[PDB]
Amino acid sequence: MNTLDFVDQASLRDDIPTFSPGDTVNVHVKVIEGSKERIQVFKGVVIRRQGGGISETFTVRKESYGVGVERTFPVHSPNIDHIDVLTRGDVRRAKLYYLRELRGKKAKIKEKR
Amino acid sequence: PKPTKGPRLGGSSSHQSALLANLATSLFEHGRIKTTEPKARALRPYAEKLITHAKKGALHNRREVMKKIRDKDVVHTLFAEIGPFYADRNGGYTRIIKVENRKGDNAPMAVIELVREK
Amino acid sequence: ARKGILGTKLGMTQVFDENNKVVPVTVVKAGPNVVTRIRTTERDGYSAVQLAYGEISPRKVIKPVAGQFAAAGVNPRRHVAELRLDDEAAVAEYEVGQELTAEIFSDGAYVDVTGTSKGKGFAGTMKRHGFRGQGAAHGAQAVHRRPGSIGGCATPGRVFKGTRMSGRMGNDRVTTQNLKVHKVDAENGVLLIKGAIPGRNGGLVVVRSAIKRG
Amino acid sequence: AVPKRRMSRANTRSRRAQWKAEAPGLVTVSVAGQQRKVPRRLLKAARLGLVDLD
Amino acid sequence: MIQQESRLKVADNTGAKEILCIRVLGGSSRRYAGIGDVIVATVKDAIPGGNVKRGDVVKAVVVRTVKERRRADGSYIKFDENAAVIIKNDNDPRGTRIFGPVGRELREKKFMKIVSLAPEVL
RNA sequence: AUGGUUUGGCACCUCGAUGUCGGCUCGUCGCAUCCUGGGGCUGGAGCAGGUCCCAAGGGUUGGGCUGUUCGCCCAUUAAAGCGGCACGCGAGCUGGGUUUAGAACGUCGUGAGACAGUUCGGUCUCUAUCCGCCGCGCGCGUCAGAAGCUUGAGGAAACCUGUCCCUAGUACGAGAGGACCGGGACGGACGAACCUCUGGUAUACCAGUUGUCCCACCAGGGGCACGGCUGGAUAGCCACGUUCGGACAGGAUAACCGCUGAAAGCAUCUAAGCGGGAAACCUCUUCCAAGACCAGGCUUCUCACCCUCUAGGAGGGAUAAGGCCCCCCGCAGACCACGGGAUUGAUAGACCAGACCUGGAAGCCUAGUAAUAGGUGCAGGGAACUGGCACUAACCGGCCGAAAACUUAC
Q1: CA distance E19 to E7
Q2: Buried b / exposed e across E92-108, counting CB within 10 Å, b at 16+?
Q3: Among A103, B43, B118, C50, which residue has the least CB neighbours within 10 Å?
Q4: How many domains would you assign to chain B?
Q5: Is the CB of C134 under 7 A from strand F?
Q6: Which NCBIfam families does the entry mention (chain D)?
């Protein structure tokens, strides 16, 4: 029954779209740039998802200007205003760590048809 | 089930797995065996979970049991009598009785047997 | 003056503040406490208040403790502890039978949590005292973790009481200071304390107002 | 390291006195009618007749 | 986490290709340098036509790291390689162009010129 | 004039054995103080220094060359202190140097050989008796037997520091430059607690796969090959992770600044006095602590029943409160101990459900010549975490364990 659940559920966040590792999403993250608000979109591949309830975190990896970038976000973080799932990937693993060594043609992911 | 907190029983993990499998086979084939108390203590959850698999008798569960028992006559008995016998009992299929110590090394012996009350 | 309460460490979780920062918070079951005895200078020589916490079946208490609780006038509780105050005016607001709950603390308050640290067993110097071990190669012979030198060359020819070597570790009362109470859940009687408090989950802790930042 | 000196009788006897065996506690049992002493650890086994009793 | 005798790729166009860290400035006996820390480094590899030369002792700031670095809001950022940008005493790049993304940590450390020149700030 | 920290001199000390330099690990002490702290004069305008007093609480970096100590150099830093303790520390480690036997070079000797000249190579033994130190128990004591909560004499731990922003570009200063005091934020090193996050581990978890043997055979699996090898991996332990700490305040003070004034009609911070004055001292923070023999205090519980020798005391037995042993266990643990439960029970296991990990089970059907792919299906499998559930085991049970009296005062 996960004793801390009654504390957890108060801060739990609904409306989170369902997604799995391998899907391609763009995360709308609000940032601070000289005390003004703007949303910076991070589009990449979800390579892992470590379930913990409120402490559930997912990682998104993107290739930008020839340098790989990985960002880990708490799923229920208020800093994430909205998550949009673009494509559904076809993978055989729960964590895609093997993608850290692949570039371009070899790093593509099958699409669930 | 829960792995042993300390070092393994037979001196290695593979020997411990083989030891547990053989002890479970002997217990199912005879109905009660006598062994050192820690061996029966570790054997209880293993045999009880095998009996739980045998209770819900399907081909999948039969394969699950056979991947640990390796003895086909014992598997047949387990899925023919031992399984249906404990149909309406929820847990506690076995019991442990502590008996007199061994003479050679003063090891604490214990007898583990299946319950036949109901 | 310095408020206090007996509680239980439930676990640790995560919360987000109003700046969207993450706050690792420890959940403390600051349940109902009942004052059982009052220590006064005129009778005991010092001023303190005694609190009772926990629930146990009445057949589990021995006759002396049950008699003490009956003389106090309340049902027996599992845990009994004393809060050392400073003077009689501090103890004037507590009377026997009064029930203390979590809402004595407020959001943003600074507290001191006291508990028994986790047990680590017979721990060597590398773990107990942070000793740096010797080299793991270059010919070092069976000294990869031993402390090395102890004393020196005769003179005192002894070992100078207080020398740090291996021994039992943990299981000691530990106080963590200036912990900020992030939220006081009154309806569960639960304190959300930012940080880590000593002890295992389900252990007994004492939450007191901070002595430095309060 | 080797002992530098021969241990005196007093120290030897005092430390030797700690090597001893404790008497196990016995409780009675009724098997086949006759009453006899059995350790409480083996009470259930004796009641089910799993312990050889001379 | 960059320390002594560690090698970093150069993310600017001063002609240097690879530098070796010498010291981590910002306190005595300091151990590691994350995103936004200034290090003293020597150039190990340089472009033949570049203005810098091998063995030159320079001052650089780390802009990318392989070890993930926690942020205030509970999120993390991890890059693919360790990268540094050569700067002068006034915290401006000695180059005029920055290659690859950088971290947000360069903003709170008052590296405004590098942030503006960077192709993208994450 | 001090010191025995340098080379010396003597040889009292050991040749029926006292390891010879550096390095590592671990210290402790002195102040003749490197930084931080407090002041004085400045040939001190401010900045920054020069120099001299008080001050030992803390700190005092990583590398290149050399066996090195030493030393030079490269980056920093608040600073990269000097010394004592067998020039600390080899029953703690190393053998790079020196200091056996092999061999070579230069020089000396006719020769065997030699050189506080050079170079390559060259066994570092031991089950801890006593003191000492770190932890843990047993016994007894504390004037009946016990049980809760504590006071604390006394002791230990900790004590570091930087940059930036306001005051303020003011005081001072031809200008440059450049503040005192007080507030705030962010750091470096160190220490502790903890496992929400990140990361490491994972020998009864999940999946893939190679060689081989076996389950009669296909299918599905199993043993071995480092858990065979890989991809993940909840709990526990942990750091590279999270949080927190160094305080504030008071007292007496050092150098010093002083007030009030004698001896000595003035003067004099002084011989009477009274004050300020530091990271040092006593408190203050955390921890241990009544074996503190002055063996403490506040309470609560049982608060009684025989037999014997001779009635003086003693001995024995059975008891009460309570404790222990046996039993079920723990994130408590070498053993012991500690903590929880013991049928009036959720202590452990099993069972059911959830969380989480893995990633789509077997069988059947469909498509494909086949490898294989899709559906049945967030499937199947499973440890630690959570909640229910007496099904199994905590048992028709043993051992200990309660009062001489007297004096004085009231």
Answers
A1: 6
A2: ebbbeebbbbbbbbbbe
A3: B118
A4: 1
A5: yes
A6: rpmF_bact
Asked if the Cβ–Cβ distance from E73 to C14 is below 8 Å, we say no
Query: From the list E75, E77, E101, which residue is nearest A65 (CB)?
Result: E101
The answer to whether the beta carbons of residues B37 and B109 sit under 8 Å apart is yes
- B70 CA to F205 C1' in angstroms comes to 21
How far is E2 from A15, CA to CA, in rounded Å? Answer: 40
Q: Report yes or no: C83 and C4 within 8 Å, Cβ to Cβ.
A: yes
- Residue E24, beta-bridge partner list: E39
For residue A2, count other CB atoms closer than 10 A to its CB.
8
Q: What separation, in Å, do the N-terminal and C-terminal C-alpha atoms of chain D show?
A: 50
Q: Tokens for A46?
A: 């979800």
CATH superfamily of E1-122: Ribosomal protein L14/L23 (2.40.150.20)
Distance D14 CA to F140 C1' (A): 16
Å from the C153 CA to the F9 C1':
27
Tokens coding E20:
């070796």
Of the partner residues A33, A64, A77, the one whose CB lies closest to the CB of residue E120: A64
Answer whether C15 sits within 8 Å of A74, measured CB to CB: no
Cβ of C145 near strand F (under 7 Å)? The reply is no
Q: Are E71 and E92 in contact (CB under 8 A)?
A: no
> In the numeric block, which tokens belong to residue C38?
């009052």
Give me the residue spans of the domains in chain C: 1-214
Q: Which of A7, A77, A78 sits opposite C13 (nearest CB)?
A: A7
Give me the phi and psi of B93, to 5 degrees please: -75, -25
Domain span at residue D14 reads: 1-54
Residue B1, token pair as written in the block: 């089930």
In the block, which residue shows the tokens 């942020």? E71
Domain span including residue A64: 1-113
Tokens of D39: 């350790």
Tell if D7 CB is < 7 Å from nucleic strand F: yes
Q: B2: domain range?
A: 1-118
Domain ranges of chain E: 1-122
Q: Read off the tokens for C41.
A: 């200078």
Q: How many domains are there within chain D?
A: 1
Phi, psi of A88 (to 5 degrees): -110, 125
